[PDB]
Amino acid sequence: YEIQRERIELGRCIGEGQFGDVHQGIYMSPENPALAVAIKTCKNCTSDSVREKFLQEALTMRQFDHPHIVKLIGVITENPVWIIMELCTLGELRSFLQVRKYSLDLASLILYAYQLSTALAYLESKRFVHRDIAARNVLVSSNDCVKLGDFGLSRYMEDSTYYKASKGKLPIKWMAPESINFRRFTSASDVWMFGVCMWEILMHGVKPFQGVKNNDVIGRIENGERLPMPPNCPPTLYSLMTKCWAYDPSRRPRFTELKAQLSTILEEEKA
Numbered sequence: 001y002e003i004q005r006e007r008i009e010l011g012r013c014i015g016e017g018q019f020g021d022v023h024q025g026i027y028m029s030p031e032n033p034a035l036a037v038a039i040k041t042c043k044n045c046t047s048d049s050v051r052e053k054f055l056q057e058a059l060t061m062r063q064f065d066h067p068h069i070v071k072l073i074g075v076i077t078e079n080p081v082w083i084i085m086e087l088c089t090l091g092e093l094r095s096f097l098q099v100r101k102y103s104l105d106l107a108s109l110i111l112y113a114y115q116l117s118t119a120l121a122y123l124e125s126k127r128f129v130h131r132d133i134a135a136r137n138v139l140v141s142s143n144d145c146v147k148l149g150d151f152g153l154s155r156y157m158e159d160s161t162y163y164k165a166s167k168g169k170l171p172i173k174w175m176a177p178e179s180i181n182f183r184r185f186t187s188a189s190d191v192w193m194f195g196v197c198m199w200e201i202l203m204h205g206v207k208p209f210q211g212v213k214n215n216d217v218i219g220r221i222e223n224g225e226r227l228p229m230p231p232n233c234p235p236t237l238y239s240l241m242t243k244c245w246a247y248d249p250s251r252r253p254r255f256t257e258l259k260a261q262l263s264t265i266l267e268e269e270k271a
């Protein structure tokens with residue numbers, strides 16, 4: 001996974017990161033055609049403890065290879081340490097959906113749900129629990145291709161859930177009841193979150209339970225209330241989302257079933 005720095009053309013800064021600026025750039029690969037990349041830099045990785053914390057991201061990402069999961073391209077372990085990932089040129093899914101609300105067809109929305117279900121069926125095959133399935137963790141490579149990633153300070157921390165609570169940023173509005181009540185995160189709770197993520201896509205990047213306090217969400221869910229059917233959502237798609245939201249995790253579908261059903265809904269929409 002080691003990359004030669006001279007083969008990277010470092011472009012503009014596209015964001016801030018916990019360890020240093022994140023830039024876009026070009027990787028003039030010796031084996032593959034030139035590719036656009038996102039480059040995470042690390043200002044203090046000359047320190048072994050800082051370097052190990054920063055590189056945890058490369059260690060996690062290196063395990064996976066799927067067309068709808070952000071790919072790790074490589075690492076430069078000589079100072080300054082860089083992590084090189086594929087660039088998703090169209091950026092965050094939420095802003096993309098908001099800007100193109102009147103331009104995107106329903107078929108494109110279902111296609112994004114379908115592509116994410118393939119990424120999640122793949123992670124479930126590896127017995128990997130994502131823990132934060134939400135539109136904030138999805139990037140857009142093109143108008144017909146989205147990619148699942150993961151972002152946030154809590155990912156670098158030893159006690160990830162504890163950090164979120166300290167700042168009151170636990171994603172209660174996306175979480176399965178067993179994750180809220182017992183801090184249980186499984187393939188079934190990822191399914192619950194995926195249902196909320198499909199709702200966000202159909203709602204064109206609107207957040208769930210807007211204007212509702214976190215403490216009140218728990219009560220509503222326990223009482224059987226669920227996010228409403230988005231406008232223009234096919235009834236079969238809503239039925240699928242309501243199955244993701246079964247209070248009992250054993251009644252929820254698995255991602256292989258979600259993928260097969262989303263493929264059928266997409267085919268029917270396009271027809």
Ligand SMILES: Cc1ccc(-n2nc(C(C)(C)C)cc2NC(=O)Nc2ccc(-n3cnc4c(N)ncnc43)cc2)cc1
Pocket residue numbers: 014015022038056057058060061064069070085086087088089090091092130139148149150151152155156
């Ligand atoms: C500590 C830690 C932090 C994150 C992870 N973790 N886990 C996953 C799964 C599990 C989904 C493989 C993925 C990740 N990372 C990213 O997605 N990074 C990640 C970093 C930059 C970009 N990136 C690509 N294009 C852009 C762009 N236009 N703007 C901003 N960032 C971009 C995309 C992904 C793991 C550990």
